[PDB]
Amino acid sequence: TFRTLDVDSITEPVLTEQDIFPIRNETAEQVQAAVSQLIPQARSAIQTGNALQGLKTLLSYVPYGNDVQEVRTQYLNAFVDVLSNIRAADIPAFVKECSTEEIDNIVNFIYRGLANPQAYNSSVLLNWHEKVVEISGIGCIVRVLNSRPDL
Amino acid sequence: MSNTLRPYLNAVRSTLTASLALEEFSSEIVERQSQPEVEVGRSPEILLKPLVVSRNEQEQCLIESSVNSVRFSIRIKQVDEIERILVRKFMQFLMGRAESFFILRRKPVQGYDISFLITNYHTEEMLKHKLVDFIIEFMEEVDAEISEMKLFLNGRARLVAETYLSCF
Amino acid sequence: DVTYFVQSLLRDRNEPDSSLKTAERIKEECCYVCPDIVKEFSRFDREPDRYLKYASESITGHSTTIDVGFERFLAPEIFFNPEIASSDFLTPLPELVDNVVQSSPIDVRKGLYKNIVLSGGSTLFKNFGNRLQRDLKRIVDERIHRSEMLSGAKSGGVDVNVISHKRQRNAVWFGGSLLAQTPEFGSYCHTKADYEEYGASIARRYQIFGNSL
Amino acid sequence: ATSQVLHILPKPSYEHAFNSQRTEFVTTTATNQVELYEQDGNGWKHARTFSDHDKIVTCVDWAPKSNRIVTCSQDRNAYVYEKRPDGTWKQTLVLLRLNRAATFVRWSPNEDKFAVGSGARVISVCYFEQENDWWVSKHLKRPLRSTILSLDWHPNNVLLAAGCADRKAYVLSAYVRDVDAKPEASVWGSRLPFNTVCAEYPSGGWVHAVGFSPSGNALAYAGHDSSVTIAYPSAPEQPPRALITVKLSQLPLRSLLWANESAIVAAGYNYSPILLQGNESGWAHTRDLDAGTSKTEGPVSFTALRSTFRNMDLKGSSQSISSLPTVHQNMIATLRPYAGTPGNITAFTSSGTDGRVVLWTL
Amino acid sequence: ETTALVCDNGSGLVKAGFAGDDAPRAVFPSIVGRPRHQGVMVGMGQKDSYVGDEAQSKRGILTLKYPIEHGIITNWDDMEKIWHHTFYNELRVAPEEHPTLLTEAPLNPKANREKMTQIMFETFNVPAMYVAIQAVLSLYASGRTTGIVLDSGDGVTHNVPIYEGYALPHAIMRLDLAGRDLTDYLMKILTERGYSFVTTAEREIVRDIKEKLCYVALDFENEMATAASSSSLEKSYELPDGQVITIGNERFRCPETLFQPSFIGMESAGIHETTYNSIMKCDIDIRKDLYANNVMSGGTTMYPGIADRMQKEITALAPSTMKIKIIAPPERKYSVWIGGSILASLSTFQQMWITKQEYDEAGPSIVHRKCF
Amino acid sequence: ETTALVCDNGSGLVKAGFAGDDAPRAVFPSIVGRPRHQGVMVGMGQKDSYVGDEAQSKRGILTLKYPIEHGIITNWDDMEKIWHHTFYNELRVAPEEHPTLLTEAPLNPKANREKMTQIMFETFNVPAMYVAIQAVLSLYASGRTTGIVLDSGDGVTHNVPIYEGYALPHAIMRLDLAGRDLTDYLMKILTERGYSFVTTAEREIVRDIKEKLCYVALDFENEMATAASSSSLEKSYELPDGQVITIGNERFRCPETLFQPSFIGMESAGIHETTYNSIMKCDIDIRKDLYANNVMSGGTTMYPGIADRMQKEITALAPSTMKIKIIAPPERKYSVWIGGSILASLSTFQQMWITKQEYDEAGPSIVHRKCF
Ligand SMILES: Nc1ncnc2c1ncn2[C@@H]1O[C@H](COP(=O)(O)OP(=O)(O)O)[C@@H](O)[C@H]1O
Numbered sequence A: 001t002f003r004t005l006d007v008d009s010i011t012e013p014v015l016t017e018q019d020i021f022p023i024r025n026e027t028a029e030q031v032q033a034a035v036s037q038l039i040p041q042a043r044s045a046i047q048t049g050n051a052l053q054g055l056k057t058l059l060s061y062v063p064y065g066n067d068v069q070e071v072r073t074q075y076l077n078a079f080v081d082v083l084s085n086i087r088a089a090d091i092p093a094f095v096k097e098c099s100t101e102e103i104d105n106i107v108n109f110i111y112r113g114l115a116n117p118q119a120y121n122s123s124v125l126l127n128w129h130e131k132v133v134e135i136s137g138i139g140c141i142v143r144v145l146n147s148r149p150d151l
Numbered sequence B: 001m002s003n004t005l006r007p008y009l010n011a012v013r014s015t016l017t018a019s020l021a022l023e024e025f026s027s028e029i030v031e032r033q034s035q036p037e038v039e040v041g042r043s044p045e046i047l048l049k050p051l052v053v054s055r056n057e058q059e060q061c062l063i064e065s066s067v068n069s070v071r072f073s074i075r076i077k078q079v080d081e082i083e084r085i086l087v088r089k090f091m092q093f094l095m096g097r098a099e100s101f102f103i104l105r106r107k108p109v110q111g112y113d114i115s116f117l118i119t120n121y122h123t124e125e126m127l128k129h130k131l132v133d134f135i136i137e138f139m140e141e142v143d144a145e146i147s148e149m150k151l152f153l154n155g156r157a158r159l160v161a162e163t164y165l166s167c168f
Numbered sequence C: 001d002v003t004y005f006v007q008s009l010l011r012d013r014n015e016p017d018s019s020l021k022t023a024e025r026i027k028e029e030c031c032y033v034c035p036d037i038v039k040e041f042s043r044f045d046r047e048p049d050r051y052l053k054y055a056s057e058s059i060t061g062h063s064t065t066i067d068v069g070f071e072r073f074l075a076p077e078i079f080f081n082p083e084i085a086s087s088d089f090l091t092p093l094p095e096l097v098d099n100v101v102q103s104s105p106i107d108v109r110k111g112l113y114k115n116i117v118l119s120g121g122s123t124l125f126k127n128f129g130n131r132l133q134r135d136l137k138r139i140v141d142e143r144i145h146r147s148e149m150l151s152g153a154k155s156g157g158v159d160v161n162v163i164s165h166k167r168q169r170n171a172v173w174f175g176g177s178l179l180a181q182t183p184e185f186g187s188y189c190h191t192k193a194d195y196e197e198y199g200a201s202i203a204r205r206y207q208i209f210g211n212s213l
Numbered sequence D: 001a002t003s004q005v006l007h008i009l010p011k012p013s014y015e016h017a018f019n020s021q022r023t024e025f026v027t028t029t030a031t032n033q034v035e036l037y038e039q040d041g042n043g044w045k046h047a048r049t050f051s052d053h054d055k056i057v058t059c060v061d062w063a064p065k066s067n068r069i070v071t072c073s074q075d076r077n078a079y080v081y082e083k084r085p086d087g088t089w090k091q092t093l094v095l096l097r098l099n100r101a102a103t104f105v106r107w108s109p110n111e112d113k114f115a116v117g118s119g120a121r122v123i124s125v126c127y128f129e130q131e132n133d134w135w136v137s138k139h140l141k142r143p144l145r146s147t148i149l150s151l152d153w154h155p156n157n158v159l160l161a162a163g164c165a166d167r168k169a170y171v172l173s174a175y176v177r178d179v180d181a182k183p184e185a186s187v188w189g190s191r192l193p194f195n196t197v198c199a200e201y202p203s204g205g206w207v208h209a210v211g212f213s214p215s216g217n218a219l220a221y222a223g224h225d226s227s228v229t230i231a232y233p234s235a236p237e238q239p240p241r242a243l244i245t246v247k248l249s250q251l252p253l254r255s256l257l258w259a260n261e262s263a264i265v266a267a268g269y270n271y272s273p274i275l276l277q278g279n280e281s282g283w284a285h286t287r288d289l290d291a292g293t294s295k296t297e298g299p300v301s302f303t304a305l306r307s308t309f310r311n312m313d314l315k316g317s318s319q320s321i322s323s324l325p326t327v328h329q330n331m332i333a334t335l336r337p338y339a340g341t342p343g344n345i346t347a348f349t350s351s352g353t354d355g356r357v358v359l360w361t362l
Numbered sequence E, F: 001e002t003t004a005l006v007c008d009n010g011s012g013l014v015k016a017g018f019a020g021d022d023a024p025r026a027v028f029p030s031i032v033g034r035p036r037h038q039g040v041m042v043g044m045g046q047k048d049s050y051v052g053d054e055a056q057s058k059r060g061i062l063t064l065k066y067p068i069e070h071g072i073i074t075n076w077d078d079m080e081k082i083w084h085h086t087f088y089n090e091l092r093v094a095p096e097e098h099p100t101l102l103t104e105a106p107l108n109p110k111a112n113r114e115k116m117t118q119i120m121f122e123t124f125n126v127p128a129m130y131v132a133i134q135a136v137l138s139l140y141a142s143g144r145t146t147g148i149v150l151d152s153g154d155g156v157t158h159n160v161p162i163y164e165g166y167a168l169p170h171a172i173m174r175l176d177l178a179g180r181d182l183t184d185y186l187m188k189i190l191t192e193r194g195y196s197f198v199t200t201a202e203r204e205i206v207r208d209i210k211e212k213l214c215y216v217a218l219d220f221e222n223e224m225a226t227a228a229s230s231s232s233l234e235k236s237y238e239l240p241d242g243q244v245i246t247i248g249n250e251r252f253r254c255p256e257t258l259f260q261p262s263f264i265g266m267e268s269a270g271i272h273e274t275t276y277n278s279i280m281k282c283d284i285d286i287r288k289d290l291y292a293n294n295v296m297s298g299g300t301t302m303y304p305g306i307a308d309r310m311q312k313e314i315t316a317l318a319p320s321t322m323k324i325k326i327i328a329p330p331e332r333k334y335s336v337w338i339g340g341s342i343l344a345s346l347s348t349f350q351q352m353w354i355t356k357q358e359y360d361e362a363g364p365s366i367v368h369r370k371c372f
């Protein structure tokens, strides 16, 4: 009886995720508009056979947050399509011509794309993951392990 | 086996070897005690984000890490319900002897069929550069076993049918 | 364990046949319990008709009689003297029963002592129940009298009735058969739906001995 | 560089410490025992053990000036050891008043006081009262939020760098009256009362280690994201001039040691130490001191043959087991100086879960 | 889909690989062997059954059994084991992610085809599968469209005339004399010179002897007369035991069993008379083209000088007014595979598969009404 | 880990020790000798029987007699006495505390093994024991898996050809000629020189002579011819009494009986020929591996110059193509014990014991059920 009904959850409020990572200064409408502006540029770049430039442009800004679920899903769908619309033979040059933070975003989002395979194509994500881990190293996956949960 | 599972297998290998940077850490809520932090989940400031690796909708690799303990549960293919029953029974036998395995859980997490749990001590004493080797080796050999055992089922059914029918 | 003891006793005397089945049959028609070991040894030395020769006929050894000896009373004594079998246990059976009854709640001690039920096929030894009852009665009398001279007053005492019945060999089976016929027994069973719902660990919480959690 | 394996401990060692004369060294193991070793010609031999504690011993540090040993363990108590004139050592409990297991201890450069990290939200700083022959602990609980994972003193003897497990690096003033005199004005600050928030810096993971530069005007900390950040303070309540961050492509770093006024050596789960050359402009990884990818008609002995059959029977391979290239076999514990004047270090030791105590000769 | 599996589960040898490739990734003998001793050793990884190259290498302490006999699978357990080996141990590709192509000799029992299709669909859960005849594959490989194909292999020899894009099923002749029977005859006739071969290991050794030494003569009587003055015709072979054996008239005698089946006591026409009868059974207007296109295929047709002798006999049988030409590419050992891969890598072939959704809605009898 | 006694009750010596030891720590002759004199002297606690080194030292007035005859036990009481000595006075370990590992020659009588296990269980109350074969343990100690093991101890000489893991039971050839017969022949041929050795003590003396003054000649006829110019062949030996012996052709004549058993009147082939016969009894494929793996064993094979002669003879017998390699480890004297100790400390082995309860419930036939 009295063994159940735990009380430790209220007397000492445990640290909650916003206490660990910096809070998002941008507003929901601002980031939503920014993503809604970035995505069609990526789609158009895919249409004109310049998928590398489209991915580079889409990689410049990356949204996050617990209140931006829908726009994050649209961003992820666009990113998955852009990456799947890239020839495989040109990957190493792209990977080598990036900064560490950009590669971190790439690996983070491809790994999140791996989490939902009932709607995506896993083969291209796995191939990209293999090549980026081969070239950049394991530090990218380390950063993935130590990234924000909302990312 | 391989020549077939290159990208999925290497992704699992890399993620596992990156997620095995464990450390000795006590309990932040109980004194003079240390527990696997991935299983309790009471202090979120030391729990790395859950990570999932997949190749197809029926194959997943949930990778949950922490400061000291790592839990790694996978799903293996079950194309037809014969393989479903075979996988369930085989993996039950596999987890029934977790005492001699040191990196197994007696009961997998829900929605899966097996869950490894590498606490710090295993990395402390057992050299861990082949724990992952055993992981991938098992992930392919298990499908090998399921196919072989369904072949053996067919063979024994044929043998018993012939034995019954020949004695008219 | 006492069968292994009987086999070892046949071993030391270098009998022509020492098969384990021979030891089992030697118990089946030979062994009996005795009051004490030294007096029984003296009686065996004096009395010469207690020296039997069991006919073995193992496989082809026709009329290879096995001359049995002191085993007939040395074997059953392990129950009332467990030191002989091994050092893993050293408390004699009546003393252990006394400890079991004393550790029980005070109010049920009279009921525990009044009714003692034998069970299993290894309690069919002659004079087993008599010796067990005698030892338990002696120990309880010793404790009661010690309390009496400590206090200085008489008491009615407690009686002990070790009970043996016509279904000693398979009492467990007979009790199970009598219990299963009750209509309420069906409700107590683990239904298959419960197993398929709650998993294969439906019966792991051990209930009779000890309290869970 | 060049490395020599001093000894092969039978069990993992998370810490080590050498005396001032570098004659005998103390080390910890998995259990509650604390091990001592002394030279035996060209090697080392067992000396004695300490069983005073009850639970797993966490950290041990040796005071070189006074030749004293302190030990903080999981049992929430601290022991201070001083050798007797005959040769034996005298134990002495310190009442830390902690609520959880201690994690890391360090002696001040003046060895008058020692601070103790803990998982009880707090840090305990203890000094000695000659008038009462007592050790008293003070709790630092104002800015702290999570478990202490590392400690680091300052040459001014007052500032204390605390590496917390809340993805934030902490610097506090541990100055106490009746023990330390007033410290000089510093780039970190001048007004330094007890338990004041000197600085706070963020990170991308748990701050495994922190470290002040030999000049005493900088901080270097490493998170769990395999990134080492070098901080250059400017003024109190003033953002630092430059926060240089170098991101690596290996396993996360564990401990940081300052090779000189402009060099940092740090090692972690990569089974190897690294070196950082740079200045205020920036920093970059310089060299892999562990040789990198080295990958380093006769009768067969009975023991080898028996090993071959045992491997064949228990296995299906009967081949060489590991042949790992790196000198260490598991994660490294810490790096500590071995010899040389301050700012001039050429030798530093290290310990790991494999039990190897590998000296590194720059 | 990127590539499709294809397996030539022949009676003696099995050829497997991917469609479009020009080289067998995996060829191993179709042998499943079980140990026949105790094993007082400890460990050693006691494996219950060795299949394929492992069995061929360790035949010293194993008894070998061919699952396929005369082109008809008789040990379905061993056949399933061999297919599992091909799928997992050598090609090591998941069966569920690759359509597969199979090959079956003509005029086989329908039970063989139905059971093979059912096994592939249910026990291995392949996406799609197809069954094709050897002669069509040989024509596909050779690039032709008209010409009677002689497919002589380890288990069975069959002839399937095929005009331009059309096959005449009523003129298909199948003969049950093949490489296994030739090896048995060689074992029988090597006894007359002293050497005795009994166990299955000796059978494989005799097969190697036939590989390295046997050849087809031009005129049997003249060759025997030459062998009577046994001066410059005998050869020598080295057994693994180290003993050297000498071969004589039986070096070329046992290949003649193909042309004179009475040697092994069977009443049937030779591999030339059966071809002549098969051509004559066709329409008259297509014989003038079938004569000009004689296709040699299969492992058995690798004997030196077999093509010349067969051409001589067919020219003797046929009228002189119409020329006879026989063709045999140097890679005819894998002609069946090459044709299978060419067929499997065709765009027009994509709609002729048998998908699982098609199979489960019609039962295992669908293969009879779709494949052939 | 799970130390077990390893007792190899050889026909001439009893080598014993714990499992895992590099070399056995208990080696002494298997001799039980009672006094044969009245012994009017009183006192000093004169025992009624002496075993082992004590018997060898007191052999001046002792009637030494071996309890084993050509590997077969014939003096069960004496062998029980020897086993008691080994367990208590030499190893100083209680039998009921560690399991034992015994060896026996192949093709031995079944009653011998049955009584061996019966005694070791009923009498010494050992937990468990195993009865291995000398050739298998020699293969263990040689660190190989294949090859035919020639074992020649004091009692009997036997060859057990073993391929990878598997051992052929139909190719085991056992020859009773051994070291004791060689010693008897040496006694016989020393009479023609003049020196007479009769009793058991003189038999031990002549065994000591053969221990260090005998060898196997690479060639026999030429060696006997050059023995006529007796310069570098003979060399003196100091008899215990003090008079010196001088043996010439007797040095290499008495070990020649191994290769020419007709010297002692036996219609049997020598070791060099029986090895070839045993090899030929096997299959045709494993013979090449057996040729290159010849594991010499036993104490008799310690003659300086036996491996060279054996290799020459086997090369002469065998076909000239493949190489004949003979393996003569310098420690092959204790090879059987080395193999037994290696086998005992294996994880899979604990399931192969004969537990005391299993024997009690199964009778003495459990050794036939399990061991072999
Ligand atoms: N060069 C050769 N000379 C003689 N016989 C051969 C030669 N090559 C193969 N063979 C025989 O042909 C057989 C090969 O059969 P194969 O053609 O693979 O059967 P399938 O066509 O059913 O796969 C072997 O058993 C072998 O005996």
Ligand SMILES: Nc1ncnc2c1ncn2[C@@H]1O[C@H](COP(=O)(O)OP(=O)(O)O)[C@@H](O)[C@H]1O
Pocket: F009, F010, F011, F012, F013, F152, F153, F154, F155, F179, F180, F207, F210, F211, F212, F298, F299, F300, F302, F303, F333
């Ligand atoms: N160096 C040697 N030279 C000649 N003969 C030897 C030598 N060593 C041992 N022997 C002979 O070998 C015999 C001992 O063989 P042993 O190894 O005991 O076989 P087992 O153990 O089967 O009885 C002795 O009779 C001895 O004559």
Ligand SMILES: [Mg+2]
Pocket: E010, E011, E134, E153, E154, E298, E336
């Ligand atoms: Mg074919």
Ligand SMILES: [Mg+2]
Pocket: F010, F011, F134, F151, F152, F153, F154, F298, F299, F336
């Ligand atoms: Mg021997």
